[PDB]
RNA sequence: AGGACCGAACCGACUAAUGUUGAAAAAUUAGCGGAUGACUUGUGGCUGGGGGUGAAAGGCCAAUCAAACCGGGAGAUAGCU
RNA sequence: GCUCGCCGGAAGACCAAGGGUUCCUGUCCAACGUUAAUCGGGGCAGGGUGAGUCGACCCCUAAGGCGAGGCCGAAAGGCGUAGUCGAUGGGAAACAGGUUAAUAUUCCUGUACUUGGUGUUACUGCGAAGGGGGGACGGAGAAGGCUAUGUUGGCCGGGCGACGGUUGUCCCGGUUUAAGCGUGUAGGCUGGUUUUCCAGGCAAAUCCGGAAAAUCAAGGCUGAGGCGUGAUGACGAGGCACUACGGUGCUGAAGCAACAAAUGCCCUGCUUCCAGGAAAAGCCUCUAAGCAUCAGGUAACAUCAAAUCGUACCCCAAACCGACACAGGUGGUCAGGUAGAGAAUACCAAGGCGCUUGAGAGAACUCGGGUGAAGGAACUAGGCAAAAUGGUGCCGUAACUUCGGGAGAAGGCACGCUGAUAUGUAGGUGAGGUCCCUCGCGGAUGGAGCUGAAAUCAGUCGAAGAUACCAGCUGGCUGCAACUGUUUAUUAAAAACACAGCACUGUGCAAACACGAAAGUGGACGUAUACGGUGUGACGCCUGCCCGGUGCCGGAAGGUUAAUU
């Protein structure tokens, strides 16, 4: 669970770390690793397009299965592994033909559990089946949006999507944000919550803990000059504007959804 | 103190050398002006 | 040349240093 | 490695520079001046087909031209190529 | 164990004095801060001017920066000297 | 040439970068050298850089670059797939001695090693751009084994002292030796082997992975260093004849041990932590197309080949960057003695220097220091600057506190040399001898020799024993900022910026947003416990009332309202 740090120095006084002793204390599975070089927030023009990104620890990418193509073939979990690419943990599972794959680790899953994908699997956490074969009212995760595309909804550390209705070729989903959303019923999804529900309980304690995740410091706009940010200068602390982005678009209340081709999919917006 | 010019032959030839000027339209126009002026050295290159 | 040397002129003498490169 | 026109174009000059004489009487090494593109095989083939002697090995170095000046003008001598040809035991020169 | 303590290399620059046609177009001497980290450094690479980059001072972008430098418009214009 | 002085974690030695003949020798002193110059990094001329193993070139890739086609853009052009480049990384092999005025892992002597082409005897299943394994990797810490290296003893050579003494338990010097080859050790990883099947590895596969029986417990990989050979050699303190003073042809003694010991090696190990730690080839292994007494591979030996470029010299500097023979700047490696915790510091060794104007005199004043009666901050904007404190062990230590701190609070005691406990103790290392053995780089018993802290008692010297160098001033009240950090390169280091935390707001993914005429890329190979923006700034207690103004969100009734007709 979460453990306090004793304040033997400033910068340890407020640290809370999430300890999971059942994670694998060894090197990851080398056939499922690739290279993952940092961008620093730079695109192919070499420009900072997203601010406050850069530095941080080296990472290797873990190829996690989101599609879950291996229908019918049973799989046993070998072990839970730490993944630096996401807020959840992952699970090296072992199929019965000798193929090893990483998946998202759900809530109660440990080493030795039986998982199975496909159309006629069981109903237990870890199994992946289409949403036209699931009892209406259950909490799901790793939810696809197109049939075959790969799971995109509820991938985080402790999130879940609850199926609330079925009509036509569609099921209605109460997303984790508070939004009712119609998805097709050929889209696969995986039972149970994804399992790292104490991830939000950590407090980083110090500035270097944010710096070794690749988060550079954020300068307030009101600390800048008028040429730099619309929140300008002034003698002393003056604000005197309405709060906007660095590009003059009004923040703190102004909606920015303009898509108009996915309005046939949204029953109710979030709150 | 530490000065402006810290020389390096690889960076000099990758920045101002002949293949770098010939690689683009504008460096070829620079070499065209340096031939129209009568310069003995088009680029640095040595 | 370029050392500056006055509090504020374009070029005077002065033993200070923000005004002064001839 | 060999054709006779190239072998007649390889060698230029016997080199006499008071390390050449020490190398002749100490290490059985004659010191020659060769062309700027002559490889070791061409020098060895030219020494055997042109001096009638038999060669252990050929070592080569490139001598870099020295700068000599007059006023605002600076000239440079040519680069040349020195060879150390080691004979087996017997020799004429 | 620790953005832990003291302290050399190393990275900085808090105070004083010297120097100010300097040994130096920003240093020297004596003390001084950090010194396992948000550290520092070699080498290569990318971002280009109303643009970049900025733990943000309008700071830095080749001793130049409230808009670099070079060439051109160009013999701009100047009721001013 | 002899004395003196300075550096000695550098002001010594070797390189990379950069420079480009400054290297060595002869000759010259007009100009250059902040003086003179016979000298020189200066003029003139000549000489000097030798490689299958070192580096480059080469094979392979990272960030990134170019990019057939392709997509997009008035044009120029942009982005990108296949590819092809791109080291700062991965990949074959050589050391020791000597020698030139100037080159050396390159030349010579001795001893080696690696990879290709081709030839001969045999064993035969060979084949790639594809499959698999490996290459292949983080921070920190701790222990063990060593070695470089040093010290002492033994031995060998030389010395018996310009002035009291020096045949002694005295003085000075030397006591060095590599790669390769064999051994496979201290350790570290690992459970091996056979047979049968398979929805996995783009197709296949004897390979990898999975599953199941049978058998067995020693099998394989890795790995410092030690030892033997290498070595009947080389080097080596000193001597034989000579000399053109600078040495060369010549032999050449001992060349042993024990202890201490790295930041180096085993070690890319082991443990532990979260922040979860390159790629691809060489290498091994498996087959598709193709060929099967041929071709191809494998074990052994012979034979040929290993090209081309760099190599001088400087390289914390008078040779690079700074206009200068400029108190500046500049990455890596080597890292001795005594005292010390130490790469601090002090004195020294090897080695290198005395910094390219001197000679005097000994005014004011300026700079850098030393000391100072009595008073002791009276100075001044202000204790600025100086003075002062300063080390190890031990005793002791307040308010407050977030229970960690405060704290090295404050404050104080001992400290040198000699003798004894003990001809040198506890501890550390560890020979000879006895026995056992899966028989060696072993295990017990052992304890010599070597090294050696701190303590206690007594004595004794001085004014002073942390004697030099080195080396905290301390306490009390209070503002701001929680803190470590960051910042106006060159007048401002701060109460500013950041910060962990908190909140509000947007964002349902082909996301919001950003860069871009666009294609597209970042966000992100992430998915609302995530991401972008904005404000406040740890933590404790809290965060009140106002929606009339402006903004934002919601609503659609009515009015007003553009292009169009």
Residue numbers in the entry:
A (entry chain CC): 2 to 272
B (entry chain C3): 1 to 46
C (entry chain A): 2 to 23
D (entry chain CU): 1 to 93
Q: What text does the study give?
A:
Here, we report the discovery of a new LAP BGC in the genome of Rhizobium sp. Pop5, and characterization of its product, phazolicin (PHZ)—a previously unknown linear thiazole/oxazole-modified peptide, which targets the bacterial ribosome. PHZ is a 27-residue long peptide with three thiazole and five oxazole cycles in its structure. Similar to KLB and erythromycin (ERY), PHZ induces expression of Katushka2S but not RFP, indicating that PHZ is an inhibitor of translation. The newly discovered antibiotic PHZ represents the second known example of a linear azole-containing peptide with a known mechanism of action and mode of binding to its intracellular target, the ribosome. Although the PHZ and the previously described LAP klebsazolicin both inhibit the elongation step of prokaryotic translation through the obstruction of the NPET of the large ribosomal subunit, the mode of binding of PHZ to the bacterial ribosome is significantly different from that of KLB.
The obtained charge density map, characterized by the overall resolution of 2.87 Å according to the “gold-standard” Fourier shell correlation (FSC) method, revealed PHZ bound to the ribosome. The high resolution and excellent quality of the map in the PHZ-binding site, allowed us not only to fit its atomic model (residues 2–23) but also to confirm the positions of seven azoles in the structure of the modified peptide proposed according to the MS–MS analysis. Similar to KLB, linear modified PHZ peptide forms a compact globule that binds in the upper part of the NPET of the 50S ribosomal subunit where it extensively interacts with the 23S rRNA and ribosomal proteins. In comparison to antibiotics of smaller molecular weight, such as ERY, which binds at the same location but only partially occludes the NPET, binding of both KLB and PHZ results in nearly complete obstruction of the NPET. A prominent feature of the ribosome-bound PHZ molecule is its complex intramolecular interactions that involves both face-to-face and edge-to-face π–π stacking of Thz12, Oxz21, Thz6, and Oxz18, along with the nucleobase U2609 from the 23S rRNA. First, three azoles (Thz3, Oxz15, and Oxz18) are involved in π–π stacking with nucleotides A751, C2611, and U2609, respectively. The N-terminal and C-terminal parts of the PHZ molecule are located between the uL4 and uL22 loops and occupy more space in this part of the NPET than the C-terminal part of KLB. Superpositioning of our Eco 70S ribosome structure with bound PHZ with the structure of Tth 70S reveals that residues His69 of the Tth protein uL4 sterically clashes with the PHZ molecule rationalizing why PHZ does not bind to or act upon the Tth ribosome.
